Motif scaffolding. Structure first.
Motif, short mmCIF file in Angstrom:
data_model
loop_
_atom_site.label_atom_id
_atom_site.label_comp_id
_atom_site.label_asym_id
_atom_site.label_seq_id
_atom_site.Cartn_x
_atom_site.Cartn_y
_atom_site.Cartn_z
N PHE A 81 18.12 102.98 33.73
CA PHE A 81 18.68 104.06 34.34
C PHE A 81 20.03 103.85 34.93
N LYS A 82 20.98 104.74 35.10
CA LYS A 82 22.33 104.50 35.52
C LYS A 82 22.50 104.93 36.90
N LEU A 83 23.05 104.20 37.55
CA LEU A 83 23.32 104.24 39.21
C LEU A 83 25.11 104.38 39.48
N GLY A 84 25.21 105.69 39.85
CA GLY A 84 26.54 105.91 40.05
C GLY A 84 26.95 105.94 41.79
N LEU A 85 27.62 105.13 42.38
CA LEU A 85 27.94 105.04 43.79
C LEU A 85 28.85 106.35 44.07
N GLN A 86 29.22 106.29 45.12
CA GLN A 86 30.05 107.39 45.77
C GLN A 86 31.70 106.85 45.48
N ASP A 87 31.80 105.63 45.48
CA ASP A 87 33.07 104.97 45.34
C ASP A 87 33.50 104.95 43.95
N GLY A 88 32.68 105.56 43.00
CA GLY A 88 32.94 105.43 41.57
C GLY A 88 32.46 104.29 40.71
N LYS A 89 31.44 103.58 41.38
CA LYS A 89 30.92 102.43 41.05
C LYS A 89 29.56 102.89 40.11
N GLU A 90 29.79 102.41 38.97
CA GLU A 90 28.55 102.72 37.92
C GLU A 90 27.80 101.72 37.44
N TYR A 91 26.77 101.31 37.62
CA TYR A 91 25.91 100.18 37.18
C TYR A 91 24.79 100.56 36.12
N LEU A 92 24.58 99.60 35.40
CA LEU A 92 23.28 99.79 34.31
C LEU A 92 22.09 98.86 34.59
N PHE A 93 20.97 99.37 34.83
CA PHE A 93 19.90 98.50 35.19
C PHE A 93 18.80 98.81 34.20
N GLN A 94 17.99 97.77 33.98
CA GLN A 94 16.94 97.69 32.85
C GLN A 94 15.83 97.19 33.43
N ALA A 95 14.85 98.15 33.74
CA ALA A 95 13.51 97.74 34.33
C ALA A 95 12.50 97.28 33.29
N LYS A 96 11.48 96.80 33.77
CA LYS A 96 10.48 96.08 32.98
C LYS A 96 9.86 97.13 32.04
N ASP A 97 9.60 98.16 32.69
CA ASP A 97 8.96 99.41 31.94
C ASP A 97 9.29 101.02 32.65
N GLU A 98 8.71 101.75 32.02
CA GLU A 98 8.86 103.07 32.83
C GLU A 98 8.60 102.95 34.01
N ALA A 99 7.66 102.24 34.40
CA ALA A 99 7.20 102.45 35.87
C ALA A 99 8.35 101.63 36.76
N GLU A 100 8.60 100.22 36.59
CA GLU A 100 9.57 99.49 37.26
C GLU A 100 10.87 100.41 37.37
N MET A 101 11.10 101.06 36.16
CA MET A 101 12.50 102.06 36.08
C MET A 101 12.13 103.31 37.21
N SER A 102 11.12 103.91 36.73
CA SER A 102 10.87 105.39 37.54
C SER A 102 10.88 104.87 39.14
N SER A 103 9.90 104.12 39.34
CA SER A 103 9.64 103.57 40.74
C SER A 103 11.13 103.23 41.37
N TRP A 104 11.87 102.41 40.69
CA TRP A 104 13.27 102.06 41.20
C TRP A 104 14.14 103.36 41.52
N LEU A 105 14.21 104.35 40.72
CA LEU A 105 14.76 105.65 41.04
C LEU A 105 14.07 106.31 42.23
N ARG A 106 12.79 106.41 42.21
CA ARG A 106 12.05 106.90 43.41
C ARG A 106 12.47 106.01 44.74
N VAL A 107 12.87 104.66 44.35
CA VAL A 107 13.11 103.96 45.67
C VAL A 107 14.58 104.12 46.15
N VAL A 108 15.44 103.97 45.20
CA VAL A 108 17.14 104.24 45.17
C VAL A 108 17.22 105.54 45.85
N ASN A 109 16.24 106.47 45.51
CA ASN A 109 16.44 107.75 45.98
C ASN A 109 16.02 107.65 47.33
N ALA A 110 15.06 107.16 47.68
CA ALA A 110 14.23 107.01 48.89
C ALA A 110 15.35 106.18 49.94
#
Length: 123
Positions: free
Chosen positions: A85-114
């Motif tokens: 999943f790609k994470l784009g900050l507000q300062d124009g910072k974009e990072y790329l993270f690779q979860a262990k699976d669709e779970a870890e990933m999806s979860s992250w988002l759910r968290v990062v979003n939280a």
């Protein structure tokens, strides 16, 4: 999320690859490296591993990126890696993270979003 969100913490081994350091700005490192993502208080921290996370040892001394007005979406394009999943900050910072699976990933988002919604609450 949308509104409220008590507090969703999340931390695990992820491949953080700093692509954009700012709006239309190409990062430097831009190298795939195993960086332990540590979310808390609505801030995404980076550490070597769970060994450096429990030892409060910063990967290179980088502080946690505030997810205040940050965006978190899947990496729909990466034709090589999976559960990324790609994470784009507000300062124009974009990072790329690779979860262990669709779970870890999806979860992250759910968290990062939280975390984004909630915001970096301080006192």
């Amino acid at each position: 999320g949308s509104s409220g969100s008590s507090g969703e913490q999340m931390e695990g081994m992820l491949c953080r690859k700093q692509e954009m350091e700012a709006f239309g700005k190409k990062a430097a490192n831009r190298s795939w490296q195993n960086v332990y993502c540590v979310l808390r208080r609505g801030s995404l921290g980076f550490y070597k591993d769970a060994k450096a996370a429990s030892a409060g040892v910063p990967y290179h001394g980088e502080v946690p990126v505030s997810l205040a007005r940050a965006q978190g979406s899947v990496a729909f394009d990466y034709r090589k890696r999976k559960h990324v999943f790609k994470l784009g900050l507000q300062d124009g910072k974009e990072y790329l993270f690779q979860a262990k699976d669709e779970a870890e990933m999806s979860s992250w988002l759910r968290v990062v979003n939280a975390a984004i919604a909630s915001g970096p609450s301080s006192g």
